[PDB]
Design a protein around this motif. Structure first.
Motif, PDB file in Angstrom:
ATOM      1  N   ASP B  20      16.685   1.729  39.662  1.00  0.00           N
ATOM      2  CA  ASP B  20      16.631   3.047  40.265  1.00  0.00           C
ATOM      3  C   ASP B  20      17.154   3.364  42.542  1.00  0.00           C
ATOM      4  N   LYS B 133      21.725  11.647  39.508  1.00  0.00           N
ATOM      5  CA  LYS B 133      22.317  10.482  38.818  1.00  0.00           C
ATOM      6  C   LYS B 133      23.270  11.247  37.720  1.00  0.00           C
ATOM      7  N   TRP B 138      24.392   6.321  40.127  1.00  0.00           N
ATOM      8  CA  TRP B 138      24.263   7.368  41.464  1.00  0.00           C
ATOM      9  C   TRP B 138      25.179   7.964  42.395  1.00  0.00           C
TER      10      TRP B 138
END
Ligand code: NA
Ligand code: NI
Lengths: 168, 168, 168
Positions: B20, B133, B138
């Motif tokens: 992430d 997200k 994202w």
């Protein structure tokens, strides 16, 4: 061949390394942000609490985090706008609790008032930092650098500084 | 002690976090590249499709991604060369689908033609972005910033601009 | 559902990707540091040893790493201070041994002596690099770029260059 447990052990070591690298990159980011923001108490939290540390950049040397921030507060007063912009890190984790980080620095300094009013200073440097990990947290212990270049000049007083966080 | 399954679970969480963080750093990179390249349709894909979002930087506020890119296309015309250079990110993953990112910005703007011909603007800022997200991807939802400084000045018309992607 | 072994396999692939991304970011960092430091032998170690490579940036093309460093040593002599500052990478691992990297470059060049004494050149560019992995190590094979802008100008000879690593 390797068992599942051996493969997990390998992954645990690899992920710890990547986590440490990311923690170090964020630590240095915080240092620069606090330095240029003149957030001296917060900057102090990035420096190692291990006072066996000589807190040095190879030129300046101090004996505690507070001595470092006392120097910086005097050396980088409200009349000095600073930008220290780090680029392209090379972080090496050296052990479970030590590491090295190369950073490519550009610095720009502007004096807005006082004896050095209208002085600008620009430069670049290659820094090699040393870090240590104490109770789960990374800290900066010391550094050294090679100055690529530095230039000093008088800025045109007709330039309009429209924003300055150290006045606002 | 921990079983092999528990250790795998821990690794899965750690790797998801690092993935992430990297996805967010690349998202912001794409934003800057599209912004300065004036690739407005592509820039729009970096902005959250969740229109419960107020798309804001704390100063300017819009109500859709298209409104954002319509503003930018007008505000940053072909006659304006821009560089927005991000440094030293501090990305915090806040949940499974939200995150925060500090970025250290330097901006340089040059007007080559029109009413503001030969105006240059340089500055720095500390940005704190919010991300979300959605379906594995994202997006940027909004931001806020502190302007370190900003300066406006007239550039010497004798300077030779030898390359300009917005003319070529 | 997935067995423990399947979950380990997935983690091994994810961690290898993150490790490759980090190795590539450090490789490019080393390239810039060696380029600006004029460490030509060390810079050569960042370039692919696969001489099926045409070593190109889309404009200049060479046929070995040594040809590249011979060109650079001549083109970037001691009288030229250079800063090539990379920002905001977008690294994509394309296979087990190939990858692509977008980089946002700012360059500043200063000539201190010789025929071009007092010339300054500033610019920006979007680079897209291609990398290859040979015997566990990543190398740069070639690149292409779009020049955002470039400006050439004469620097005031009253500016004081106080540090210069290429004289010291
Ligand atoms: Na700069
Ligand atoms: Ni920069």
């Amino acid at each position: 061949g390797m068992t599942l447990e051996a493969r997990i052990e390998a992954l645990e070591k690899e992920i710890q390394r990547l986590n440490d690298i990311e923690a170090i990159k964020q630590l240095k980011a915080k240092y620069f942000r606090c330095l240029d923001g003149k957030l001296w108490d917060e900057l102090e939290t990035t420096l190692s609490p291990n006072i066996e540390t000589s807190y040095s950049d190879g030129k300046l040397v101090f004996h505690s985090p507070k001595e470092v921030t006392e120097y910086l507060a005097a050396a980088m007063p409200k009349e000095e706008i600073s930008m220290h912009m780090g680029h392209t890190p090379e972080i090496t984790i050296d052990s479970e609790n030590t590491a090295t980080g190369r950073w490519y620095l550009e610095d720009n300094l502007i004096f807005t008032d006082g004896k050095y009013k209208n002085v600008g200073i620009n430069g670049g440097a290659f820094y090699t930092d040393k870090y240590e990990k104490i109770d789960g947290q990374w800290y900066i212990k010391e550094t050294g650098y090679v100055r690529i270049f530095e230039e000093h000049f008088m800025r045109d007083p007709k330039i309009h500084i429209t924003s300055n966080m150290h006045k606002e």
